[PDB]
Structures are given as structure tokens and as C-alpha cells.
Write a protein that binds this ligand. Sequence first.
Ligand SMILES: [Ca+2]
Length: 128
Amino acid sequence: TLGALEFSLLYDQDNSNLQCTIIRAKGLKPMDSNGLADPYVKLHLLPGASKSNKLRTKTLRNTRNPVWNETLQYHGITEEDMQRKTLRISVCDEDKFGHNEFIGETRFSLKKLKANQRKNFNICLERV
Ligand SMILES: [Ca+2]
């Protein structure tokens, strides 16, 4: 009951590129009473040396059912990287100031993704 996240992934093998489209979320749980319903999505490629492995979509305002419809790309991703790394995706609420509140997450093991074949997801969020 934290909500669910819908997104599509595509490994463009020939351009060493992992295209992650974050589509929408449904019934995102409100947590903090002082907090805002201004959600965004945070992509983190693990294990990794930070910064360049960390991507973020825009931020929607006053919504529990956000629709980002935004493609975030990781360049320089090789087959060895698809074998090694895992993609952590987490949904955060941003507050009156600039502080973020963690709602939920999910992890996609990149091993499971086949090359050039798109793969659409719709999975419930978690706290791990
Ligand atoms: Ca808060």
C-alpha cells in the first residue's frame, strides 16, 4: 500500500545505452503531515562510484498519481555492466523547503534484461 511504479527499460546494446522511461505512479502513500505531495523518481546504478550513476526526473506538484513520462538515459553501459550492476529506483516526495522524503523503492537486476528487447514494468514499491 505504498503505491506502484510503472516504467519501461531498453538496452540499446549497439550504442552502449540503457534507456529508462519513468511513466507514472499510482496511489503513492502520503507520509509526513508537514510533507508535500511533490514526488520525483531517483535512479541509482549499483554497485557504482556515484554522481554519474545517479539520475533524477522532474518534480510534479500536489499529486498522489504522478505521470512523469520522461526518459532518462545511462550512456557508457556495456554488457559487462549489464552483467554486473543493478538498477535501484526510488520515489521521493520533496517538501516546503528542499528536503526529500523517501516513500518507496524497487531494484531491477540488469542481468535479467535481454538486449534490444524492451521490457515494461509495473511493480509495487517497498522499504528495504
Ligand atoms: Ca517530510
